[PDB]
Each structure stands twice: as structure tokens, then as C-alpha cells.
Amino acid sequence: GTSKLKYVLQDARFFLIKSNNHENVSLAKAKGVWSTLPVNEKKLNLAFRSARSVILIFSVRESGKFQGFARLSSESHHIHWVLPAGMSAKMLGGVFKIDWICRRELPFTKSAHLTNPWNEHKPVKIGRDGQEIELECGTQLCLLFPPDESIDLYQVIHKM
Numbered sequence: 413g414t415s416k417l418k419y420v421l422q423d424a425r426f427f428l429i430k431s432n433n434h435e436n437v438s439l440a441k442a443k444g445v446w447s448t449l450p451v452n453e454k455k456l457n458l459a460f461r462s463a464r465s466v467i468l469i470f471s472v473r474e475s476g477k478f479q480g481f482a483r484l485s486s487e488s489h490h491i492h493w494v495l496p497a498g499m500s501a502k503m504l505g506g507v508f509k510i511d512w513i514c515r516r517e518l519p520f521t522k523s524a525h526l527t528n529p530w531n532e533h534k535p536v537k538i539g540r541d542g543q544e545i546e547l548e549c550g551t552q553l554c555l556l557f558p559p560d561e562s563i564d565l566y567q568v569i570h571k572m
Contacts, residue, residue: 414555417554417555417565419572420565420568421550421554424547425466425467426467426550426553427459427542427544428469428542429446429448429471429542430471430540432472433496436494437470437472439491440510445491446482447507448506449503452541453506457488465484466484467513469545471537476520477520478517478518478553480514480517482511485509486509488506489508490505512560514558514559515560515563516558516560518553523535523537523553528545528549529549530543530545536549
């Protein structure tokens with residue numbers, strides 16, 4: 413009822429994740445892992461040791477929707493990802509363990525009022541993979557997601 417969620421998002425860092433396919437997100441939602449290119453891998457690692465929470469907000473390219481958001485529980489570490497054109501297991505080699513906070517979709521149409529000061533105040537749906545979102549903008553975007561009844565926040569809060 414927002415109280416638990418607001419405590420989790422308190423002093424958090426927010427990053428957009430863009431996936432080239434639906435299957436890797438379905439995979440990530442089940443096993444609680446994610447991997448990204450080394451550029452974004454470094455940033456999330458720096459962000460993990462620095463912030464009380466690091467939140468990843470997912471969107472499949474060309475879906476028109478966010479598919480959910482998750483909190484890193486570990487920095488990356490060295491998963492049968494569906495590798496897109498340009499494949500290299502090693503490129504996506506580091507595996508972040510993530511705890512999902514919401515696995516339900518949020519259409520871009522519901523976040524049209526929210527813009528990101530850290531991306532030239534462009535609408536928050538706009539950004540490349542790894543685009544960091546300013547605290548309040550990312551907090552509001554997370555609050556727009558519907559409650560996920562499959563999710564129990566106890567293990568996230570317990571790890572904090």
C-alpha cells in the first residue's frame with residue numbers, strides 16, 4: 413500500500429533497461445537475474461555499492477510498454493539468454509541477481525506526464541538502455557505501476 417514501496421524507493425537510483433526481445437524479460441522475471449552490456453554493467457556496479465537501492469525499469473523495444481521493475485540484490489558476477497543479432501555470451505556475461513518489485517505492464521500512455529530531468533527533460537519513456545532517471549521522476553514512474561499480487565516485498569525489505 414505504497415508505504416512498503418516508498419521505503420524501498422527511498423534514496424534509490426533508477427535506470428531504464430531496454431531489451432531487444434520479450435523472451436529475455438520473461439526469462440528474467442522467472443529466475444530473478446539480468447545481464448547487460450559492459451558499459452551499463454560498470455554503471456550498475458558503481459551504482460550498487462553507492463546507493464541504498466538500484467532500481468531497473470524494463471521495457472521491450474517497440475512494445476510501447478514498461479514490463480515491470482526490479483531491485484538489484486547483487487552486483488554483477490561471472491543463463492541461456494536469447495542472444496540478439498550481435499550475439500556474444502561474454503558481452504552479457506555478468507549476471508546481476510534482481511528481486512522483482514512489479515512484473516505487471518505499464519503502457520507508455522500512462523506515463524506521458526512524467527519527464528526525466530537527466531535526459532533533457534524528455535518523457536521518461538524516452539531513453540537508451542541504461543539511461544539513468546532522476547530520483548523523483550523514477551519514484552513517480554514506479555508508483556504508476558499496478559500492485560503485483562505475485563510479489564512479496566518481505567525479502568526485499570529484509571535484505572535492506
